[PDB]
Amino acid sequence: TMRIAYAGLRRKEEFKALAEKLGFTPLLFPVQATEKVPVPEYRDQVRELAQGVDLFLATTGVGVRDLLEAGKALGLDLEGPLAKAFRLARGAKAARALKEAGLPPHAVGDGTSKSLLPLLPQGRGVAALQLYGKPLPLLENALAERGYRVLPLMPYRHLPDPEGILRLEEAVLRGEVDALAFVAAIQVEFLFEGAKDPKALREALNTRVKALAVGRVTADALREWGVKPFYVDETERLGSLLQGFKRALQKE
């Protein structure tokens, strides 16, 4: 009788199959239009980074590794400019990738964007921001306030489904959902960035609707938005997510 919304683009049929095997009612509410479309401008962005920046802001371990490799593949010196820049890491995986390159961050967040706000220096010039497929509106605004132009470094781009986002928000706020499964952090971000009433959505996901997260990255995205995940799965199996949700219900 639990009504479980799924925000993923893939495995929609497996989810429905698992729902009808575990006695849940499945609901499909995708929030992305596209997934991982290459960004043609990326090599140009990396060439601009090589011209020097005042600040560098890392979000992921894999994104830092891929960025540093791209600079080398392109015949660029990124190490020199990045050594001169003030460097931040949103979380431990980005920090560690930087450390491994001999470029350990000056400031490290707690895995959320908001944790970097008190750590941003007032400055000038350019803030290069290593991205994972979408804008970071909170940080972009904060950086513009602090006197920086943002240089995005983004090898691919995910796009939101704005109407799908509004439909999912409505279903939550109309009491039509009991739990909400996010399989990726960008689904959480897209939902809250595209919502009419993120405060109400946050309230709903802390009380009447149980947020389910695949991975600590997805869980951190919920935390960014002030939501306490009901259950966080650390496998890549949907069956594990739903079975762990069941065990968490038994326990509460």
Offer a quick outline of the entry.
With 252 residues, this protein is α/β, with parallel strands linked by helices.
Can you put this structure into words, describing what you see?
By secondary structure, the chain is an alpha/beta fold. It folds into 2 domains: 1-36 and 158-252, Rossmann fold (3-Layer(aba) Sandwich), CATH 3.40.50.10090; 37-157, Rossmann fold (3-Layer(aba) Sandwich), CATH 3.40.50.10090. It has helices spanning 12-22, 42-49, 61-73, 79-84, 92-100, 137-145, 162-173, 185-194, 198-205, 216-224, 238-251, and strands at residues 3-6, 25-28, 32-38, 55-58, 86-89, 107-108, 126-130, 149-153, 156-160, 179-182, 210-214, 231-233. Helices cover 43% and strands 21% of the residues. The PDB classes it as lyase. Keywords: heme biosynthesis, Lyase. It forms a monomeric assembly.
CATH-derived topology of the largest domain: Rossmann fold
Note the main sheet. 5 strands, parallel
Q: What is the CATH first-level class name of the largest domain?
A: Alpha Beta
Secondary-structure element string: EHEEHEHHEHEEHEEHEHHEHEH
| Count of distinct strands | 12
Strand content: 15-25%
Quaternary organisation: monomer
Count of helical regions = 11
PDB class: lyase
Keywords: heme biosynthesis, Lyase
Assembly: monomeric
Entry title: Thermus thermophilus Uroporphyrinogen III Synthase
